[PDB]
């Protein structure tokens, strides 16, 4: 009767948490942000088109300098573009041309790639030989890779499809910390702007906070009806926005442990592939599958603009460290840097 | 444009040239996905030629250099976008499921599960114009079992001439091809066994037929 005894306790705990969350909501985001001027029609143009790819673009990451952005494509090449000149600094070859992630280290010395081979490869950029070579292939996952983010030059936080996330130590190659608690395939992870907390969203329609220092979950965020295909983090580090597959993004507050606003429209029937915020936090750049890059206002829960221009679906977004530009990569082997 | 900028532009152009060289040397190759369980141990093609387990081949001198791509062990809805441009799909089914038992406690069927997987793959939105080469393996084993083991376990109409050992094959073909309701997909099929050699020639023929059909469809001739 162990299963029967424990399930009642689990249901009681879940009901108590739900009741506490309901009682801890005096109002909503709209009730306090309805007195502010509308953001206005934020329309941006294609300043540059980083057109050098062949197959679909699956992910993209900027750098700390707001100049270099890496692009991962199933053709097998990790091109380190130069945004201000549309150049190609590097063309990193890949062992297996099945890549869904790319991370650019804060120091700009390492590029990460990973995919269906369950292996995250750390690529060294600054070498005395002038070529970019692997430094440490991180292995131990039993499933496909979904998102890798660099904590520092030595640690990489990796979320895979084996219902697990992981913290890796590159120098030794060992999984220093393993993360468990997801009842489904983890699809995207985001790192808080203090390298202390990181949130992940799996196919179980749940978003989970994790503390990389210890290795245990802190909060579980639910409310979505379908898979979470993207996740971001507010610049102030107390909120995070969840991209789903039911056409609705959300703003899950951290301290409040609830959802503040849902950005859903009757017209949209596709899903959200990537979600990225702006520097001020006013704009929630969401990349939908219907060849669009809809710009959602993040306080009024209202439309702000459309960044159409992509033939296929948008699969990666990025707003620079200084918030100057928003880059968009789609499955048409194209990259556009709006402003 | 200073000296550094001009040299960077030259490096970028060389990178573009190398990317084009790899792209034109990758279009020649043809991708062939490989799903199915029970009779997927196809080492014959690798021997003749020489997560994801790619097994490249070499057929028709250097004209055709195919690439096989195996399966995985996670959710099959986020790993499928990658294989949208495959020029063919290989589905392997074990004919020894006429008298089949499930791995779990249900013990219902194995070909029926294979049939459901086939229906899901055929009707998948991504593979809407990708031919499904079918390799019905375990030929001699079925030729023995349809006498010894059982006879038409499912029997909706299956195997009227059960002992004929050919009406069973015809009904299996009909059941597996009925899941393909469109004229844009050709479900090639070929029985094979361990002691066989014409196992990659059929793949080559199906690939050629698919290529010419796609060329015609992209054109207006047919």
């Amino acid at each position: 009767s162990e299963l029967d005894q424990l399930r009642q306790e689990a249901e009681q705990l879940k009901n108590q948490i739900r009741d506490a969350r309901k009682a801890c909501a005096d109002a909503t985001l709209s009730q306090i942000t309805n007195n502010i001027d509308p953001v206005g029609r934020i329309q941006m143009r294609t300043r540059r088109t980083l057109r050098g790819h062949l197959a679909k673009i699956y992910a993209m990451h900027w750098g700390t300098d707001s100049r270099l952005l890496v692009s991962a494509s199933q053709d097998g090449k990790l091109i380190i573009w130069d945004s201000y000149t549309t150049n190609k600094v590097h063309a990193i070859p890949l062992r297996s041309s099945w890549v869904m992630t790319c991370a650019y280290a804060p120091s700009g010395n390492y590029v990460a790639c990973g995919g269906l081979d369950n292996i995250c490869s750390i690529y060294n950029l600054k070498t005395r030989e002038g070529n970019v070579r692997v430094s440490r292939e991180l292995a131990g996952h039993t499933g496909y890779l979904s998102c890798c983010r660099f904590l520092d030059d030595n640690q990489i936080v990796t979320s895979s499809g084996d219902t697990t996330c992981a913290l890796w130590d590159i120098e030794t190659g060992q999984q220093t910390t393993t993360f468990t608690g997801h009842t489904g395939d983890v699809m995207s992870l985001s790192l808080a702007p203090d390298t202390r907390l990181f949130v992940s969203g799996a196919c179980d329609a749940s978003a989970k906070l994790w503390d990389v220092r210890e290795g245990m979950c802190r909060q579980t965020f639910t409310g979505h009806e379908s898979d979470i295909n993207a996740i971001c983090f507010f610049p102030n580090g107390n909120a995070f926005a969840t991209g789903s597959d039911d056409a609705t993004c959300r703003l899950f507050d951290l301290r409040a442990d609830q959802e503040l606003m849902t950005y859903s429209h009757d017209n949209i029937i596709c899903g959200i592939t990537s979600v990225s915020f702006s520097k001020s936090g006013r704009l929630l750049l969401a990349g939908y599958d219907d060849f669009n890059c809809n710009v959602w206002d993040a306080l009024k829960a209202d439309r702000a603009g459309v960044l159409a221009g992509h033939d296929n679906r948008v699969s990666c977004l990025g707003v620079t460290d200084d918030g100057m530009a928003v880059a968009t990569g789609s499955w048409d082997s194209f990259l556009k840097i709006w402003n | 444009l200073s000296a550094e900028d001009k040299a960077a532009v030259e490096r970028s152009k060389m990178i573009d040239r190398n990317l084009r060289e790899d792209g034109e040397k990758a279009r020649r190759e043809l991708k062939l996905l490989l799903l199915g369980t029970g009779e997927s141990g196809k080492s014959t093609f690798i021997k003749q030629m020489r997560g994801i387990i790619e097994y490249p081949f070499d057929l028709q001198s250097v004209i055709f250099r195919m690439v096989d791509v195996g399966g995985q062990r996670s959710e099959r809805r986020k790993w499928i976008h990658c294989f949208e441009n495959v020029t063919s799909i290989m589905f392997l089914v074990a004919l020894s499921e006429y008298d089949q038992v499930l791995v779990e406690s249900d013990n219902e069927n194995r070909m029926e599960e294979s049939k459901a997987l086939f229906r899901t793959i055929i009707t998948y939105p991504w593979f809407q114009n990708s031919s499904v080469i079918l390799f019905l393996n375990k030929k001699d084993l079925l030729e023995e079992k349809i006498m010894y083991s059982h006879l038409v376990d499912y029997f909706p109409e299956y195997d009227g001439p059960q002992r004929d050992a050919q009406a069973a094959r015809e009904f299996i073909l009909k059941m597996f091809v009925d899941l393909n309701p469109d004229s844009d997909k050709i479900i090639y099929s070929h029985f094979t066994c361990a002691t066989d050699t014409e196992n990659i020639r059929f793949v080559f023929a199906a690939v050629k037929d698919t290529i010419l059909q796609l060329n015609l469809k992209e054109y207006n001739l047919v």
Epitope: R67, D82, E129 | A3, A7
Partner: single-chain antibody, 232 residues
Framework: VQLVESGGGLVQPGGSRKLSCSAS????????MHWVRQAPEKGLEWVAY????????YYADTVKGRFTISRDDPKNTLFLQMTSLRSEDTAMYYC??????????????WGQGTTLTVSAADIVMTQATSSVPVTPGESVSISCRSS???????????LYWFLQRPGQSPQLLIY???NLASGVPDRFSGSGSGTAFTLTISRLEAEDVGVYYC?????????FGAGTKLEL
């Protein structure tokens, strides 16, 4: 990473020779290669450069035409076939590697060098100072002046500082007048306007004794400087 160059002894006034530079330790194809010479009791002087893919080749004005430089990628060797040799070209010829991308470090390696003795509108950088006596463990500043502003519209100011310890190949201290190359201690620091430059060495030691050469890299005439002697 090593670039040893050899193939030069003594040439008659009027002869010709070819200089060989065998490279092993990196990728030659992606790396451009320069050529820098220094006459005895004199300063560094630019000779030629060849880019990746043998696309762009430049030569110094004083040796224009009389020199030819070729790249041999398969054998990883550089050549310089000297023609119409004179007695004023006697110097020590170096192999300098360079790669150019965003954040690159041009002139980040210099070979041992080869000796060759022959019997009998550029941006000319100004180095008024010749020698400076500096104690080991005290700060010292070295300055050189440029005729033309060294600040392109790209926002990057181009000036390279070099160090030649006695009897050793030159090393790269600071590239683009603000960035410190690998293998150099943090004491070195460069600053200044688009015409006047400085270099604030913090704690000078026995390893900081040599001649400091400042370099201009905006035009192709990559004019170097006379240099500054450092004494204990």
């Amino acid at each position: 990473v090593q670039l040893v160059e050899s193939g030069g002894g003594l040439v008659q006034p009027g002869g010709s020779r070819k200089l060989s530079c065998s490279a092993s330790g990196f990728a030659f194809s992606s790396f451009g290669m320069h050529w820098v010479r220094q006459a005895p009791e004199k300063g560094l002087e630019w000779v030629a450069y060849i880019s990746s893919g043998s696309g762009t080749i430049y030569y110094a004005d004083t040796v224009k035409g009389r020199f030819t430089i070729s790249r041999d990628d398969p054998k990883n060797t550089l050549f310089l076939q000297m023609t119409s040799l004179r007695s004023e070209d006697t110097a020590m010829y170096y192999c300098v590697r360079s790669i150019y991308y965003y954040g690159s470090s041009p002139f980040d390696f210099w070979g041992q060098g080869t000796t060759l003795t022959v019997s009998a509108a550029d941006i000319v950088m100004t180095q008024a100072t010749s020698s400076v006596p500096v104690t080991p463990g005290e700060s010292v500043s070295i300055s050189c002046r440029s005729s033309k502003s060294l600040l392109h519209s790209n926002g990057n100011t181009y000036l390279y500082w070099f160090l030649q310890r006695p009897g050793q190949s030159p090393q790269l201290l600071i590239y683009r007048m603000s960035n410190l190359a690998s293998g150099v201690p943090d004491r070195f620091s460069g600053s200044g306007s688009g015409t006047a430059f400085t270099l604030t060495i913090s704690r000078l030691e026995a390893e900081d004794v040599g001649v400091y050469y400042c370099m201009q890299h905006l035009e192709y005439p990559l004019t170097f400087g006379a240099g500054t002697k450092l004494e204990l």
